[PDB]
Every structure is written in structure tokens, then in C-alpha cells.
Amino acid sequence: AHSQSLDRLMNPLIDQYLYYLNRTQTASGTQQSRLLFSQAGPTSMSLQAKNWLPGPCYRQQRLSKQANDNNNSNFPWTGATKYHLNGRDSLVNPGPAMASHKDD
Amino acid sequence: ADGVGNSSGNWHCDSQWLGDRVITTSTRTWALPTYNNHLYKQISSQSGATNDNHYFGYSTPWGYFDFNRFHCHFSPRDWQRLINNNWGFRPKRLNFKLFNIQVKEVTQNDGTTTIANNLTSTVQVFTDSEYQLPYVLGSAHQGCLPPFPADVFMVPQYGYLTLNNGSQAVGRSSFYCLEYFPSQMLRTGNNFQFSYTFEDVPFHSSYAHSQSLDRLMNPLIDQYLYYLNRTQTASGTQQSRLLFSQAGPTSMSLQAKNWLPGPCYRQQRLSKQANDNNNSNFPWTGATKYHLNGRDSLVNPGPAMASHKDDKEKFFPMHGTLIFGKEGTNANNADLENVMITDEEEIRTTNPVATEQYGTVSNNLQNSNAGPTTGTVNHQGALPGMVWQDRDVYLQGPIWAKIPHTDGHFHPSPLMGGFGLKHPPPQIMIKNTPVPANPPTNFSAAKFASFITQYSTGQVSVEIEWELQKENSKRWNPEIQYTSNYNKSVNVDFTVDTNGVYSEPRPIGTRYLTRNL
Amino acid sequence: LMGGFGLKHPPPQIMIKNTPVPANPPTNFSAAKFASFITQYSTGQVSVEIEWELQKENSKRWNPEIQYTSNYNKSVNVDFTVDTNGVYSEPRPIGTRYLTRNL
Ligand SMILES: Nc1ncnc2c1ncn2[C@H]1C[C@H](O)[C@@H](COP(=O)(O)O)O1
Ligand SMILES: Nc1ncnc2c1ncn2[C@H]1C[C@H](O)[C@@H](COP(=O)(O)O)O1
């Protein structure tokens, strides 16, 4: 298993030399359209430039193990994710590799 | 094996052109402080940060050397030679040296500082050959060798991130003690060296295409393949009928074609002219972003896509290009005039426009009763028969990145630019060996917090051998070249000013020479 | 036109400078360039050895030629010599043309 997230490969100490667009609007005074740029750094990591993208996704429905949390209706077939091949629907099972759940 | 009074190396900055290859050398002076009092410290995002910005990691006393920017290795003139005369270039092998090390001890008495040579003090250097440490190089951080040889730079501190949950740390979080790697210890008179050889990697494209992807046809000749010209009768009472025709010079858009444009993931469009853009704040809200483990992250700059369509120079995609600051620019809220926004325009011929949809698809099944409706595709993954160009490399910009070790990678070319490498040039780590201050005269098992304040300086050389791909073109008319403006000016471009400050006025891409598809 | 030997490949230029030595860097990384240097200078020794080729006088001239001579008369200072305060001085410019040849 990996010891790093894909978006965290950065050096947390050092600030980038590449600018990003911080503000599309003036900060103070009468609100006005203006373009403002900044170097992304330790404080905001989500904004930095990155070399890589996550793997491809084909989305799944989410179920809850705790009883009574899931919706009340029968949808294994109807609400599922499925591929349509030669006029026949078929479930995508288990499907492309995708993490089962997010943090916590 | 030299001693105090013998220089351990010489200054080599030159570049030499063999015409098959170019060998570019850069020698610079550096200064390494003592980071965070010789201590490994964990670092984590402050609580109250947004979910997306949390991190957990470790900051180390070690520094490191990064030459990963191009202008480290190329002068603006050497860059001009390359991009003008060549269709492609790739790195072959590099050679690295540290020499003329000096370790200075610093005392402070009242308001006066005193710096003196510590002749017996040591500096530690190891290269990570086996890629066992986190690799922070390809993230386009500051701290690379300066553009201009006469500058002295400060060695950046090494720290790394690992898994987190919120701001806390899951049990898989790795801690790496760099003091656990065999490292060479140097005094004044000792020098460090290693060699490296790049793995086979595709040449970068130094060319722009002379043809659009959809124009590869012979304009004179008519096809033998029919297409559907009319779904309805031309004259008289309108009636459903199917009519076919051979596509030809008059209508090119209708012809059969063998290839499709590269994959698109769409960008928002911004206008450089003030007051043309919407009035609201949407860098974060209206952006294009990927959602990974419950955290949103911008797609920046993103898949290579043309910046703008024909005759629309003013607009640029939001978060879709590399942006460089002009000299003296603030790191916070710089005006549009201060930044330098790069342009991908050369890739129009294949890649889609970053701000435009990929195309259109039909979302229903027609019949006599239900008219055909069609959906708009704003994102498209790879389809058989796609062709695309990679993003261009600039004079200042990433040379390489490390392809993450994973089960699968698709077209592993860094999205900022450059050469994707599975075994990138190793990380060179450096720190000042701790020197204690006077211990107590009675044994205490507590750890020393008392150290002699000191730093070290020295010289660093990087010699990379670049392989070139010559222009074979038969093009009759003159190609575009990168030229300096002839008109007079107060300052000369790519030159120091009156105050001694080196500045780069514009980003320079590598794509000038033209090839056919 | 000032004088001497026109050369297409004249003796090369010898350049010298003191390698910069930084002063104590900050303890937190900053990408700004160092303005803080240790003030220092260097001294040393320099030798220049040139080998000059000569062309001898072949003349048949009977009578004595002009030569460059020092004045015999007494003086407070001697020409081309330090003074009481240690200052070297050259009293007059000396051209090279004394010996005579025919056209
Ligand atoms: N930047 C980069 N690094 C590594 N591998 C890459 C890169 N870009 C593409 N590829 C892969 C996918 C290409 O079809 C193939 C060309 O390898 P060739 O050498 O041309 O035979 O290599
Ligand atoms: N100062 C100086 N440098 C170089 N060339 C000169 C100079 N003066 C004259 N010339 C040229 C023109 C002369 O006719 C010729 C004599 O070269 P000779 O060697 O005598 O055959 O060389």
C-alpha cells in the first residue's frame, strides 16, 4: 500500500515558483472584477500544480452496513451501474479498481 | 586528499555543441544553513484549515539540491540555438560535483556578529540511488539553481508528506530518518561526485505542426466514400428521405477521417481584458478539479489542450497553463501584468481547446415522432484513434518528474511538462554535522539542545549531456524563429539591470520549427 | 595609431575575481538572492616573462650616431629614481628612434 497520497507528493516546506489564480474579484472596497495571482505553498496544497491525475472512475452506488440507513426500496438491478452490450444490460461487477470508501 | 590550502575543484560553466549532442554545464555557489536546530519535527496542517488543505508530514534538518529547471542548464542564447535548429531533444547522462566546501561558525555578542572558519567541521552528503525516500523534486518548488551564474542561492530544506486523516496520522504514515542512510562526510578539502544515466525517453517535440488534424485530406480530389447529405427532401412537400453524397473539397467537415483529437477535460475561460470577466469570486468554486479521497484538488495545469481557438488571443483557460512571475513580483495577489502566462497555442492542430467542449453525441433514439436530440461532451477519455501533443517545455520549467510507482500509468508524461522518468535523477541530500557546545561536567542522559551555530557554503557543478534531433524539413518558405526585438530599449532582455538584478522578460517555449502530421 | 604592434590574436585577457562567500543565511528557506556577503579581498604575486627578438645595427656610417644619454650635470634628484619620499618618477618620455638608417 502506498505511504503517500497522489496529491501530497509535494515538499510541504517549500513554496512553488508557479503562480495560480487566487482571486477573480477585488478583496476590499467596491467589488470589482480583477485577476490576482499567487504562488501556492504549504498553507494551501489543493491549489498547487501537479503532474498526475487519479485513475479512471466509473461510479458506483453507495450502501450502508447499518440497517435502516439505506433507502427503503428494491434497487439491486434498477439503481445499479451496468454496461449495455448487444441489447442486454449487465452489471459492472466488481468493476474498475476504485477505493471503497473515503477517510473516516 | 587535498587539505586546507588546495582547491578541490574548478569552475566549469560552459556549454559545448557537438551537433549530434549538446553538453551543458552549470557551476554555482550555495549556502546551507542549519535547519530547525538539527531536529526532525513533524509538521501538520493547522486545525481550522479546510478539509482539502490538511496534511501530515515531517521536516528534516537535511537540505537538498535541485537543478530540475531548464534555465539552470541553458543560457537564453543556448536555449535559442536549441529551439530554433532542432525538432527534439532528450537528456542522456548527467554528472554532479560538490567542491570547495567551507564551514563557518557564527558567534553573536551584543549587537555584533562574528564569522570564523571552522576547519575541522564536517558536512554530510548522500545521493539516494534506490529511491527509498519520498521524491519531492517534480513538484515545481523553488530553490533550484539560479538562472544567472553569478548568483548565490540558498539550499532548500527537505521535508515530506505521508498519509493523514484530517490533520492526524494513520498508522501507515511512514517516518524516514535520513540519518539512517550511508552518507559521505566531508571537510574542507573533500569533494563529492557521482554520475547518472537517463533511461530511454521519448524526444520532446520541439516542433509545431504544419497541418491541422482534420485537414490531412487532398484538397483537390473527391472521396469515394458516401456520407448522408440529406435526411429530408430538398423541394416540394417536405418528406423523410435519405440522400447520400461523396464529400469533397467544398465540404471538408463532412468527410470520413481516420483520427480523433486528443482527450479533453474542460477548463473555464478567462479574459485578460478587465471588466470582460464575470464579477464574482470563482477560482475555487467555478474551477475544474478532481476529487481524491474526499478532498477536492484543482486540475492544474491539466491535460495538454490548446489555450485558445483561432483569432482569440485575449482569453486563457483558468488553471490551464503555466504562469511565471516577472522579477520582483509579490507571492500574493499579483496583478495580471506582473505574471507571465504561457500559451499552448501550438497544439491547436491536434489537442482540443481547453475552454471548449470535446464534441457532441446523440443522447436518444429518434423516430418519426421524436426528433433527434444530442448531448455535449465536456470530458473525454482515450478513444481508439486519438492523437495528441504533450505540453511544451519552457526555458524556466520542470525538466522531469518521477512516474509514481503504481500498477498502471497512462501516457506517463508530466502534466506540467518535461520527461516522465521511472528512475529520475537521484535526490542529493546535504546537512551540517552537529557540533555540540561545551557539555556539563557531570553526566546527564538528556539530549543536547546546545549546539554551535554554524553554516556551510561551497560550489556545485551539474553537467548534463543532451541528445538532439535535427530538422530534416523540405519546407520551402522561411520558418518562424525566436528572435530578439531590434528596437531600442532602456534594458536588454535576459540581462541584469542597473541594480544588478537578473530578469527574464518572457517565457520561451520550444516549439517554432514546423513538421507535418 | 597610438603605437606598437597590431595583432589579430593579441595576448589573451587574464580575468580574476574573489569567489563570493555568503554570510550567515536565515534559518528558514527564502528564495531571494543573497545580498549578505563576507567582506574580503585578495593579494598575491604576478610574473610576466616576454621574449623579445632584436634586429642588430649593420650600418657603415662613419661618424658617431646619436645615443640616449643621461645628463652629466649634478642635480637634486637622479632621473628615473625614487625621491626622498619614496616616489618613483619618470622625467621624460623616451622614444626608440636614435640610430639612423638610409632610405
Ligand atoms: N514522457 C514519457 N516518458 C515515458 N514513456 C512515455 C512518455 N510519453 C509516452 N510514453 C510511452 C507511451 C508511448 O506510446 C511510448 C513511446 O515510446 P518510444 O520510446 O517512443 O518507443 O512510451
Ligand atoms: N603592425 C602591423 N601588424 C600587422 N601587419 C602589419 C603591420 N604593419 C603593416 N602590416 C602589414 C602591411 C605590410 O605591408 C605587411 C608587412 O608584412 P611583413 O611581415 O613585413 O612581411 O604587413
Side-chain angles (χ1 to χ4, degrees), chain A residues 36-51:
Chain A
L36 297 174
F37 296 91
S38 296
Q39 291 178 335
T43 59
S44 65
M45 290 181 177
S46 62
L47 300 174
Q48 298 183 341
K50 297 182 178 75
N51 285 332

Side-chain angles (χ1 to χ4, degrees), chain A residues 31-95:
Chain A
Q31 294 178 172
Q32 293 300 321
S33 177
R34 185 175 183 170
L35 295 176
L36 297 174
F37 296 91
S38 296
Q39 291 178 335
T43 59
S44 65
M45 290 181 177
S46 62
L47 300 174
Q48 298 183 341
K50 297 182 178 75
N51 285 332
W52 307 109
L53 267 298
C57 182
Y58 188 79
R59 186 174 182 172
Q60 296 296 324
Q61 182 61 258
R62 188 183 68 192
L63 295 173
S64 177
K65 291 175 180 177
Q66 293 180 336
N68 291 337
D69 290 346
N70 291 284
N71 190 32
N72 188 340
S73 64
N74 194 32
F75 53 89
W77 179 253
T78 60
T81 185
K82 61 184 68 178
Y83 66 86
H84 184 278
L85 180 293
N86 193 30
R88 293 176 298 181
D89 286 342
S90 177
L91 269 62
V92 176
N93 190 29

Side-chain angles (χ1 to χ4, degrees), chain B residues 20 85-89 203-204 467-471 515:
Chain B
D20 188 4
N85 292 284
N86 292 284
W87 279 349
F89 62 94
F203 290 95
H204 180 63
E467 185 178 3
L468 300 175
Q469 185 174 355
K470 302 303 286 186
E471 180 187 4
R515 188 185 300 188

Side-chain angles (χ1 to χ4, degrees), chain B residues 53-73:
Chain B
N53 297 132
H54 290 293
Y55 64 90
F56 179 84
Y58 295 124
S59 64
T60 62
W62 291 86
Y64 66 93
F65 293 99
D66 51 353
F67 43 88
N68 197 341
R69 287 167 62 86
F70 281 98
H71 59 69
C72 298
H73 310 291

Side-chain angles (χ1 to χ4, degrees), chain C residues 4-7:
Chain C
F5 300 94
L7 294 173

Side-chain angles (χ1 to χ4, degrees), chain B residues 144-216:
Chain B
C144 294
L145 304 177
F148 180 75
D151 291 345
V152 176
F153 69 95
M154 179 173 172
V155 175
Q157 188 176 356
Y158 176 75
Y160 61 91
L161 295 174
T162 187
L163 280 43
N164 60 38
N165 189 339
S167 63
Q168 292 177 334
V170 299
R172 294 180 183 171
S173 296
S174 294
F175 171 75
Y176 296 95
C177 181
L178 276 67
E179 298 277 12
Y180 201 55
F181 299 65
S183 65
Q184 184 174 353
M185 294 180 73
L186 295 60
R187 299 183 189 277
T188 64
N190 289 284
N191 60 347
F192 177 80
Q193 184 175 355
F194 70 91
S195 295
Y196 172 78
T197 299
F198 289 89
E199 61 185 343
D200 285 344
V201 63
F203 290 95
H204 180 63
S205 294
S206 295
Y207 58 87
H209 295 294
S210 294
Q211 291 177 331
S212 178
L213 177 64
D214 56 356
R215 295 289 180 266
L216 284 49

Side-chain angles (χ1 to χ4, degrees), chain B residues 9-284:
Chain B
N10 296 132
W11 184 270
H12 319 285
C13 192
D14 67 354
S15 176
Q16 62 180 19
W17 291 88
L18 278 308
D20 188 4
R21 300 176 159 79
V22 59
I23 297 169
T24 57
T25 307
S26 297
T27 305
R28 306 295 169 85
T29 300
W30 53 272
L32 177 62
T34 299
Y35 287 130
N36 67 350
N37 291 284
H38 303 84
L39 296 175
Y40 289 83
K41 295 175 180 177
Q42 72 174 21
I43 58 172
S44 64
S45 64
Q46 295 300 321
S47 295
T50 59
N51 184 31
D52 295 343
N53 297 132
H54 290 293
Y55 64 90
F56 179 84
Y58 295 124
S59 64
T60 62
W62 291 86
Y64 66 93
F65 293 99
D66 51 353
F67 43 88
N68 197 341
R69 287 167 62 86
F70 281 98
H71 59 69
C72 298
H73 310 291
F74 290 98
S75 63
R77 171 56 185 158
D78 288 343
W79 183 256
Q80 190 178 2
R81 297 178 185 171
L82 185 145
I83 63 172
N84 287 339
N85 292 284
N86 292 284
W87 279 349
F89 62 94
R90 59 179 180 185
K92 298 300 285 187
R93 63 183 182 87
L94 65 81
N95 189 340
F96 180 83
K97 293 177 178 178
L98 291 174
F99 57 91
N100 295 133
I101 291 170
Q102 294 175 334
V103 178
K104 299 293 181 65
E105 62 184 342
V106 177
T107 61
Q108 295 177 337
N109 299 131
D110 290 344
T112 59
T113 188
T114 298
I115 296 169
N117 288 282
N118 188 340
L119 294 176
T120 60
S121 179
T122 301
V123 64
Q124 296 177 337
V125 176
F126 70 94
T127 186
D128 182 4
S129 63
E130 294 178 351
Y131 301 126
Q132 291 171 331
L133 292 172
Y135 187 80
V136 297
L137 268 305
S139 296
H141 297 294
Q142 295 174 335
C144 294
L145 304 177
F148 180 75
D151 291 345
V152 176
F153 69 95
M154 179 173 172
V155 175
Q157 188 176 356
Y158 176 75
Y160 61 91
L161 295 174
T162 187
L163 280 43
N164 60 38
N165 189 339
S167 63
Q168 292 177 334
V170 299
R172 294 180 183 171
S173 296
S174 294
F175 171 75
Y176 296 95
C177 181
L178 276 67
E179 298 277 12
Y180 201 55
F181 299 65
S183 65
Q184 184 174 353
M185 294 180 73
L186 295 60
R187 299 183 189 277
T188 64
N190 289 284
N191 60 347
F192 177 80
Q193 184 175 355
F194 70 91
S195 295
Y196 172 78
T197 299
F198 289 89
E199 61 185 343
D200 285 344
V201 63
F203 290 95
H204 180 63
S205 294
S206 295
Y207 58 87
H209 295 294
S210 294
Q211 291 177 331
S212 178
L213 177 64
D214 56 356
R215 295 289 180 266
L216 284 49
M217 65 193 84
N218 187 339
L220 276 65
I221 304 301
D222 186 2
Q223 289 183 334
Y224 60 80
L225 294 174
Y226 288 85
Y227 71 92
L228 178 67
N229 190 29
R230 297 281 295 176
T231 59
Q232 191 175 0
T233 58
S235 64
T237 300
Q238 294 178 172
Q239 293 300 321
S240 177
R241 185 175 183 170
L242 295 176
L243 297 174
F244 296 91
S245 296
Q246 291 178 335
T250 59
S251 65
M252 290 181 177
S253 62
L254 300 174
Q255 298 183 341
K257 297 182 178 75
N258 285 332
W259 307 109
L260 267 298
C264 182
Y265 188 79
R266 186 174 182 172
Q267 296 296 324
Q268 182 61 258
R269 188 183 68 192
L270 295 173
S271 177
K272 291 175 180 177
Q273 293 180 336
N275 291 337
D276 290 346
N277 291 284
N278 190 32
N279 188 340
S280 64
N281 194 32
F282 53 89
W284 179 253

Side-chain angles (χ1 to χ4, degrees), chain B residues 201-202 390 403 411-414 418-420:
Chain B
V201 63
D390 289 344
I403 296 169
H411 198 249
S413 185
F419 300 94

